[PDB]
Structures are given as C-alpha cells and as structure tokens.
C-alpha cells in the first residue's frame, strides 16, 4: 500500500509508461470512465499565476511580477532587438494622427 | 466594463496605438494573447477593420519574433493569416492584422451544408499544407484559430504563438524558441512499486488546447511532427460530421486519451502507441466505434446533404484520426483525397 509504495492500481485506470522504462509512469483513476452519451442534445459534447519566459521565473500574481525588478529590467532592455529587426522590414501603411490638443 | 478597462490599459501600454486605431471590442482571448477589433484609415486605401493582437508581456522576445516570422514568411497566402504592422513599447507587443468577419463555430455548426463542410476542410488543408511546407508545427489548430466567413468563402488560419519548428524548419527563429531510473517488474501491469514511482517525469511538448491534442502529445512523445496538426484537423472534422462541439471535454491529458479510446478503441490506441515508444494499459477494454454510425447518431441524419454522406468523408476522417502519427495523412495528401472530388 501507500506506506511501502507497492501495490496495484484501483480500477478503473489507465496507465502510460515509456517502453524503455526511464520515466515515471502516469496514471488516470476515475470513478467513472468516459461514456459516449448520444441522448444529450447537440451540439453538446457526448462526454459532457504562471511562468515568465523572460525572467525564467514562476510567479504567484501576474501584475505583481510585471512590476518586479527582474521583469522591469528585462522589459526595458535591448533583448527585444530580435523583434525590432523584423518590425523594421514591415511597411507602415496606416494614417497616423497628430496627438489631439485640448 | 471589464473589456472597457482592458482597452484603456492597452492604449496606455502601447501609446502609439492611440494615434492610429480606434479600439472597439475584444474579439478573442487565449493563454498567451488577447485580440481586439479596431478601425484604422489606410494611407492609400479606404477605412479598414483591423485585428490587434496584444501578446502577454511574459512572452520571450524570441517567441514574439518567431510568431512575426511565421506571419511574414508563411502568412498572407493560402488561407494563412498575414501581418500588416507591429507596435512595441518595452514588453508590450501588438500585432496588427487584417480583420476577417467570421462565424461562431458553435452557432453555425448545425446550419452548415455537407458541401460547406467539404469546402471548409479543403480550405483548412490549404492552410496546413502551406505552414507545413515551411516546417511549422502550429500546435493549436482548432475552430477558434481558423476564421471562417461563410458568405465570402474566406478562411484564415491564425495564431503562431505556440508553434514549434520541424528539424528542417524554414522559420529560423522557431529553432530557438524555448537519481538514475531502474527497470522494474511493474511494466505493462497494474502494479506500482518504489522503483517506477521514484523515476523522474518525462517532459515533452504539449502547448495546445484541451480536446485537440493528438495521442502522441497526450502520452508525452518527445518527437512530435506536423502530424499533430492533422489530428487536430480531424477533430474539427469530427465536430463537423457529428454536430458536437467541443467534441472532447477533458480537464487533463489522460482523460482526453480515455475519451479518444472510447471513439477509436483502446486496443487500437495501445497498438499505435507501442510504435512511438509508449505502453498504454487500460483496466477495461473499450471497442472502436464505427465512424459513420457514431457521427450520424450524434448529428441526427437530416437535411443538408446529410442523409447521404459519402463513404469518402468517413474514410478521410479515419486517416486524420489515425492513432499512429507516422501513417496519419498529411495536408498535401488530404487535398488529393477522393473526398474532394469535383472541386479542383
Ligand atoms: O493570432 C490570432 N489569434 C487569435 C486567437 C485569440 C487569441 C488566441 N487565438 N485570433 C486571431 C489571431 O489573429 C487574428 C487576425 C484576425 C482576426 Cl479577425 C482574429 C485573429
Ligand atoms: Cl500481474
Ligand atoms: Zn518576467
Ligand atoms: Zn514498478
């Protein structure tokens, strides 16, 4: 059982494992496996905080992270040169208005 | 009111937009972006509606640039969205693209003729053929990323924000987007032991959307190809033929796999997964369903050319929903399938 990490999976289950046995298996145990429900009316299905790539950092709240020292530093850095280089090839073809003066 | 504040904060984030666009409404949202309808005036054309895509500011510059490179290199032809311009202030990037007025997939699903289904799939395959020729694996093919205007017969595959490159991709920037295990005797049984439980987890690509991921994605195959997009196209086709959307409804990858096995069969899925290095064990066998019977029972055979769907439709569906990614039909091959007779 749980104390010795040894036993058998309670059914029903699905178990997936890499064939070379290098990685942890992954499991699905549900009370009810999926069932195709044809009676439910169409179009219903017949079966009816994050990470910042710039800072390499998980965050608890997005707006607080966007204000962190790490992120503001990145946001104002030269790291977007790769973006700007592509933008410089695009052609601006819209009408641009002067800022409106009250 | 919430959209109103979102719009106000978008002008604040990228102030140049205020002198070019009138931002009207939010028209789409995903994990990595929000898309707005705006109006603009062209220097040498009429007034135009524009889609403004605001990328999440946690996006890495290389990922932003790779999306732009997909749009400029591969887009603008063959039903693939292109790009007009792009505006940046610091970490806030807004991509400006032509707006295409488009249907709600859910609303029109059971108000489409069979012939419109054929035209929709043909045009989806034209877009997929185009992006796959450049070695782009889109990863997020689904109705909300395939704009359809029925009256104009216009189509646009959108959103390269999750794409990955094939080994020989023509989108250069996609190449740069971001306790030893022992064997055990639990293999291919219902057993667990401390050996297999204590191994590190396999990591494989899975960016996408619930219900559209191919079996090799759900089972963490490290070597994914453009075939994953063909699976997703098959899921769209399954929705069109069955009248059900979303077809799959799963809050995790293995639940999605279990639903696929109720459609395509557990033994069949197990056999295919072995060819890509995955052992799948189900506690109870589930039979494969006949695709014609399943779709017609779910849709209710009725008016629209729907009383006489040709065998070729379900044959094509079988090839798109091929559980084996190596044999699964390609977009170039799908365009040659007899389902599309009398259209070339
Ligand atoms: O990249 C996109 N994503 C998306 C969706 C919304 C955000 C996740 N994918 N929509 C569009 C995208 O580009 C568009 C161009 C014109 C129009 Cl009308 C819509 C879109
Ligand atoms: Cl056993
Ligand atoms: Zn950050
Ligand atoms: Zn074990």
Numbering used by the authors:
A (entry chain B): 207 to 254, 293 to 346
B (entry chain A): 38 to 215, 346 to 471, 534 to 573
How did the manuscript describe this experimental structure?
CDC7 is an essential Ser/Thr kinase that acts upon the replicative helicase throughout the S phase of the cell cycle and is activated by DBF4. CDC7 possesses the canonical bilobal kinase fold, which is interrupted by unique kinase inserts (KIs). The structures reveal a zinc-finger domain at the end of the kinase insert 2 that pins the CDC7 activation loop to motif M of DBF4 and the C lobe of CDC7. We conclude that CDC7 activity is controlled by DBF4 at two levels: (1) via ordering of the activation loop dependent on the ZF domain-DBF4 motif M interactions; and (2) via the control of αC insertion through by DBF4 motif C (Hughes et al., 2012).
Crystals were obtained with CDC7(Δ1–36/Δ228–345/Δ467–533)-DBF4MC heterodimer, which retained full activity compared with the matched control harboring complete KI-2 and KI-3. To facilitate crystallization of the catalytically competent constructs, we replaced 22 KI-3 residues retained in the previously characterized construct, but not visible in the structure, with a pentapeptide linker Gly-Ala-Gly-Ala-Gly (the deletion designated Δ467–533). X-ray diffraction data were collected using crystals grown in the presence of the ATP-competitive CDC7 inhibitor XL413 (Koltun et al., 2012). Crystal structures of the XL413-bound and nucleotide-bound complexes were refined to 1.4 and 1.8 Å resolution, respectively. The structures are highly similar to that of the previously characterized construct (Hughes et al., 2012), with the root-mean-square deviations (RMSDs) of common αC atom positions between the two constructs of ∼0.6 Å. Here, residues Cys351, Cys353, Cys360, and Cys363, all which are invariant among metazoan CDC7 orthologs, coordinate a single metal ion, nucleating zinc-finger (ZF) domain. We confirmed the presence of a Zn atom in the structure by anomalous diffraction. The ZF domain nestles on motif M of DBF4, sandwiching it against the C lobe of CDC7. Crucially, this interaction pins back the beginning of the CDC7 activation loop, inducing it to adopt a stable conformation. The current structures will be informative for the design of competitive active-site antagonists of CDC7 kinase.
